[PDB]
């Protein structure tokens, strides 16, 4: 067990706001490494608690270069502090907004890193990650980090009130692959009710610039019947992925 204290850190700029408190860039005073210090107000946190609890637990046991690291935690009487990895390149969402859409190389690379992280997650029994672009951070090398962390992306089984399994993550990967290449998720519409229908019927169109290999991959992942979706290893072996990914799996 390691005891941390506020005094061990040099607090820097705020990196953002969570529904429960702020996140700051911070430097640990001895090592000088740089990290994110997330603050959660004990009070409104019971407005629940002991979950997050599950959360620090889960994130603490996950050790992967494509999953945001939790280095430790400490607390006082209105605050709990999470010592988190700092992702210097920001969010993938920011990158998508700036470029409007990603090329095949960038997309296939991100999908490789995500499939690897998801495969590791599943190997540790963790499933159903929210991998929307705003929840994906970028490390120093431009490598993606799943930053889960205590409707467009919901699979049919979910919106149709059935039970779901790890196959929900494959559906997410397909929606993500489409959003990366196109700049918007595939079932986007005006009203939630119209989006629910699109998802339920797997109703979406491809822009002309989406290639043959990309369509094959996306269409397989976005199968209504979860058992018909490819396994993560089949995604990593898909020819469109092995042609375009700038990194091995
Ligand atoms: C790209 C720059 O941002 C970061 O590097 C970074 N590192 C950690 C975070 C973060 N940038 C932001 C933006 C503002 C909202 C928020 O919470 C964070 C924070 C973060 C997002 C997700 C997690 S992991 C985590 N959060 C938890 C909450 C409760 C219990 C366990 C948790 N693990 O930490």
Q: Tokens 């061990």, residue?
A: 8
For the chain, what are the domain ranges? 4-90, 91-245
C-alpha 152, offset from chain centre: 14
| Dihedral angle sign, alpha carbons of residues 131, 137, 143, 148 | negative
> How was this structure obtained?
X-ray
Question: What's the alpha-carbon Rg for the chain, to the nearest Å?
Answer: 19
* Start-to-end CA span in the chain (Å): 34
Torsion region of 226: left, alpha or beta (phi above 0 gives left; psi -120 to 50 gives alpha): alpha
Q: In the CATH scheme, what architecture does the domain 91-245 have?
A: Orthogonal Bundle (1.10)
- Calpha distance 59→67 (Å, rounded): 9
- Calpha distance 139→87 (Å, rounded): 5
Q: 130 an active-site residue?
A: yes
- Calpha distance 107→168 (Å, rounded): 20
In CATH terms, are 4-90 and 91-245 the same topology?
no
Measured in degrees and rounded to the nearest 5, phi and psi for residue 62 equal -80, 125
Closest residue by Cα to atom 33, ligand 1, is: 149
For the chain, the helix, strand and coil percentages under 3-state DSSP, each to the nearest 5: 40, 20, 45
Residues 181 and 102 sit within 8 Å (Cβ to Cβ): yes
Domain range 4-90, its CATH number among 3.30.530.20, 3.40.50.150, 1.10.10.10, 3.30.200.20:
3.30.200.20
Catalytic residue from among 8, 76, 103, 130: 130
Residues 170 and 176 sit within 8 Å (Cβ to Cβ): no
Q: Are strands 144-146 and 70-75 parallel, antiparallel or unpaired?
A: unpaired
**137 close to ligand 1 (CB < 6 Angstrom):** yes
Q: Are strands 70-75 and 136-138 parallel, antiparallel or unpaired?
A: unpaired
Q: Tokens 């699979």, residue?
A: 155
**144 close to ligand 1 (CB < 6 Angstrom):** no
Closest residue by Cα to atom 1, ligand 1, is: 90
- Calpha distance 58→150 (Å, rounded): 9
- Calpha distance 199→214 (Å, rounded): 19
Residues 113 and 236 sit within 8 Å (Cβ to Cβ): no
């Amino acid at each position: 067990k390691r005891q941390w204290a506020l005094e061990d850190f040099e607090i820097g700029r705020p990196l953002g706001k969570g529904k429960f408190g702020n996140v700051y860039l911070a430097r640990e005073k001895q090592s000088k490494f740089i990290l994110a210090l997330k603050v959660l107000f004990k009070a409104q946190l019971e407005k629940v608690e002991h979950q997050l609890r599950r959360e620090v637990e889960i994130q603490s046991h996950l050790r992967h270069p494509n999953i945001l690291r939790l280095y430790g935690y400490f607390h006082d009487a209105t605050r709990v502090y999470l010592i988190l990895e700092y992702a210097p390149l920001g969010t993938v969402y920011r990158e998508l907004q700036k470029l409007s859409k990603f090329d095949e190389q960038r997309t296939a690379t991100y999908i490789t890193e995500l499939a690897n992280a998801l495969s590791y997650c599943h190997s540790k029994r963790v499933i159903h990650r929210d991998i929307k672009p705003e929840n994906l951070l970028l490390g120093s090398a431009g490598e993606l980090k799943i930053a889960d962390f205590g409707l467009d992306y919901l699979p049919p089984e979910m919106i149709e009130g059935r039970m779901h399994d790890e196959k929900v993550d494959l559906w997410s990967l397909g929606v993500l692959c489409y959003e990366f290449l196109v700049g918007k998720p595939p079932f986007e519409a005006n009203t939630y009710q119209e989006t629910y229908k699109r998802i339920s019927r797997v109703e979406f169109t491809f822009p002309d610039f989406v290639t043959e290999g990309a369509r094959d991959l996306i269409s397989r992942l976005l199968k209504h019947n979860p058992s018909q979706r490819p396994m993560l290893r089949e995604v990593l072996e898909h020819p469109w992925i092995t042609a375009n990914s700038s990194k091995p799996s």
